[PDB]
């Protein structure tokens with residue numbers, strides 16, 4: 001009858017009072033990220049974010065959360081990608097990701113840019129989000145492989161991709177998961193994540209403790225560069 005909290009397996013959650021229909025609808029609903037501190041507070045309808053403003057979960061009393069809005073005017077809303085549209089605001093960064101990772105030249109030779117941690121964190125920490133356009137496995141497997149550098153399977157029916165133009169931070173920085181390079185001794189894994197803005201996607205989660213400024217890597221789990229590194233690793 002009072003405040004309800006719906007946690008997702010990934011650690012994120014929706015919190016607020018449910019209307020007479022038992023649905024997350026109102027101007028005071030919020031999505032709280034896995035750090036249980038960063039939140040998007042505002043207008044939600046049936047659990048879907050219409051207008052969320054960056055805020056901080058200051059504390060909770062008997063399940064009732066106390067939020068404090070962060071200075072600024074950036075607004076966020078459910079903006080699930082389509083087969084051709086990656087985002088309504090490609091240059092609006094995700095606030096949780098912004099405080100945890102950054103892009104820089106990779107430490108891996110001839111590997112282009114990489115993703116690095118901004119902070120020291122422990123095992124199982126969500127660090128970045130892998131958002132992108134949604135296409136079928138047939139389109140990916142049928143088309144020229146040279147176009148599958150940023151493809152990541154989401155589930156049995158969808159593959160996420162960050163198409164050429166958008167692989168440049170100057171054109172797209174809403175999420176940065178596609179910047180993590182491959183390693184056979186990775187410190188992260190791709191994991192399912194229910195994002196309030198991106199919807200069902202995958203995230204980059206640490207497998208263990210990582211230090212500030214350490215490069216984040218994941219095992220792609222499969223190109224020539226990969227074969228070369230595999231032989232070297234072996």
Ligand SMILES: C[S@@+](CC[C@H](N)C(=O)[O-])C[C@H]1O[C@@H](n2cnc3c(N)ncnc32)[C@H](O)[C@@H]1O
Nearest residue numbers: 108110111112113149150178179180181182225
């Ligand atoms: C998902 S992107 C990761 C970010 C990319 N390095 C960039 O600058 O945008 C995949 C591409 O990065 C490179 N990449 C990833 N792991 C690599 C590795 N271990 N060695 C060399 N190149 C790598 C290649 O072009 C590859 O297809």
